Scaffold this active site. Structure first.
Site, short mmCIF file in Angstrom:
data_model
loop_
_atom_site.label_atom_id
_atom_site.label_comp_id
_atom_site.label_asym_id
_atom_site.label_seq_id
_atom_site.Cartn_x
_atom_site.Cartn_y
_atom_site.Cartn_z
N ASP A 77 0.81 -1.23 0.00
CA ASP A 77 0.00 0.00 0.00
C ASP A 77 0.85 1.28 0.00
O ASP A 77 0.47 2.27 -0.65
CB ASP A 77 -0.93 0.05 1.23
CG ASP A 77 -2.11 -0.94 1.16
OD1 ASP A 77 -2.74 -1.11 0.09
OD2 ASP A 77 -2.48 -1.53 2.24
N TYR A 80 4.65 4.26 -2.94
CA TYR A 80 4.08 5.29 -3.81
C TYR A 80 4.99 5.65 -4.99
O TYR A 80 4.69 6.59 -5.73
CB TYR A 80 3.78 6.57 -2.99
CG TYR A 80 2.64 6.56 -1.97
CD1 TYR A 80 1.92 5.41 -1.62
CD2 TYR A 80 2.30 7.75 -1.33
CE1 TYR A 80 0.85 5.46 -0.68
CE2 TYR A 80 1.25 7.80 -0.39
CZ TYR A 80 0.55 6.65 -0.06
OH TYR A 80 -0.47 6.76 0.88
N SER A 133 -10.60 -1.17 -2.18
CA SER A 133 -9.38 -0.54 -1.62
C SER A 133 -8.12 -1.12 -2.36
O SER A 133 -8.06 -0.94 -3.58
CB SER A 133 -9.38 -0.66 -0.09
OG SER A 133 -8.51 0.27 0.53
N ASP A 194 -14.46 8.64 2.85
CA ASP A 194 -13.40 7.61 2.75
C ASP A 194 -12.05 8.31 2.44
O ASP A 194 -11.97 9.10 1.48
CB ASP A 194 -13.81 6.59 1.64
CG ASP A 194 -12.84 5.41 1.44
OD1 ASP A 194 -11.72 5.44 2.02
OD2 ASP A 194 -13.22 4.44 0.68
N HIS A 247 -14.26 4.21 4.92
CA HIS A 247 -13.51 3.23 4.08
C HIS A 247 -13.98 1.79 4.29
O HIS A 247 -13.97 0.99 3.33
CB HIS A 247 -11.98 3.39 4.37
CG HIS A 247 -11.20 2.12 4.45
ND1 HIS A 247 -10.67 1.49 3.35
CD2 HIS A 247 -10.82 1.37 5.52
CE1 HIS A 247 -10.03 0.39 3.73
NE2 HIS A 247 -10.10 0.30 5.04
#
Ligand code: NAG
Ligand code: FER
Ligand code: FER
Length: 261
Positions: A77, A80, A133, A194, A247
């Site tokens: 996650d 980036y 997600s 979210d 979320h």
């Protein structure tokens, strides 16, 4: 625009795909009765989990990915770094979220072989991809690849991060007929404030594609908005922070809870 209200038929379809996405956290508990469950998708290095499914009633082959369910998924996650999307050489200057690209490569051979097997036997069926997600960004990368290979590809995402740069978003907008809500095949669903649709920040060279369908509480067809164009609006205007309550829960369904019929 940000236009109030959608049809009952479209609302029912968004709730169906949200149900599949939230059930992917608990071994596909209580998915629709119209669905035949196929093979599991899994890689041990990335902990990406998904399935291939088939709905004979609606003539579609559905691929679903689970969102974050482990420490390994949380590592993905937060990578980036933008990476060239070399999966599609024809996607000019397209770059994707670096962690989600590792996830995609780690399952690509499984996804492509299993989809080919279904599509070869049911060559008139549409291909649909969905997830929540992290699973939503896995679905976006997958649907981009399938769109270059097959007709009638559709994408339903819930709480999707910004999956790549503006070149990737515009490739998807063209491939999924995003220029009108009447033609779109990419439904980018968000809920209230979210925080995940605000990450990575746009300032780092990231962008969303698709038509946004913004579910405001209390949820219903009349309280869902259709959001198009470049103005900051809808979920992204609320500036939610991170993994928050909004979320976790889409159309009253919390990830893995199995509270739906
Ligand atoms: C982030 O992902 C990219 C691939 O998309 C990879 O090359 C890079 O090394 C990753 N970053 C870290 C810190 O692991
Ligand atoms: C894009 O950035 C992020 C995404 C997630 C995804 C969470 C989930 O799948 O539950 C979490 C933390 C992040 O910084
Ligand atoms: C408090 O109950 C409600 C509030 C709304 C508000 C809609 C919105 O402002 O978008 C809609 C239906 C309701 O039953």
């Amino acid at each position: 625009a940000s236009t109030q209200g959608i049809s009952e038929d479209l609302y029912n379809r968004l709730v169906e795909m949200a149900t599949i996405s939230q059930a992917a956290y608990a071994d596909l508990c209580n998915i629709p009765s119209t669905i035949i469950k196929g093979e599991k998708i899994y890689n041990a290095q990335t902990d990406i989990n998904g399935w291939i499914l088939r709905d004979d009633t609606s003539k579609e082959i559905i691929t679903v990915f689970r969102g974050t369910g482990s420490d390994t998924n949380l590592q993905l996650d937060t990578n980036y770094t933008l990476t060239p999307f070399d999966t599609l050489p024809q996607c000019n200057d397209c770059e994707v979220h670096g962690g989600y690209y590792i996830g995609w490569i780690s399952v690509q051979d499984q996804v492509e072989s299993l989809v080919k097997q279904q599509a070869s036997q049911y060559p008139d069926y549409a291909l649909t991809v969905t997830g929540h997600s992290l699973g939503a960004s896995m679905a976006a990368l997958t649907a981009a690849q399938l769109s270059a290979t097959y007709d009638n590809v559709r994408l339903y995402t819930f709480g999707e991060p910004r999956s790549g740069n503006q070149a990737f978003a515009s490739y998807m907008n063209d491939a999924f007929q995003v220029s009108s809500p009447e033609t779109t095949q990419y439904f980018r669903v968000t809920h209230s404030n979210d925080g995940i649709p605000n990450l990575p920040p746009a300032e780092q060279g990231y962008a969303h594609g698709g038509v946004e369908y913004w579910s405001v509480d209390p949820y219903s067809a009349q309280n869902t908005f259709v959001c198009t164009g470049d103005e900051v609006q809808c979920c992204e205007a609320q500036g939610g922070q991170g993994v928050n309550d909004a979320h976790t829960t889409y159309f009253g369904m919390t990830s893995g809870a199995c509270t739906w019929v």
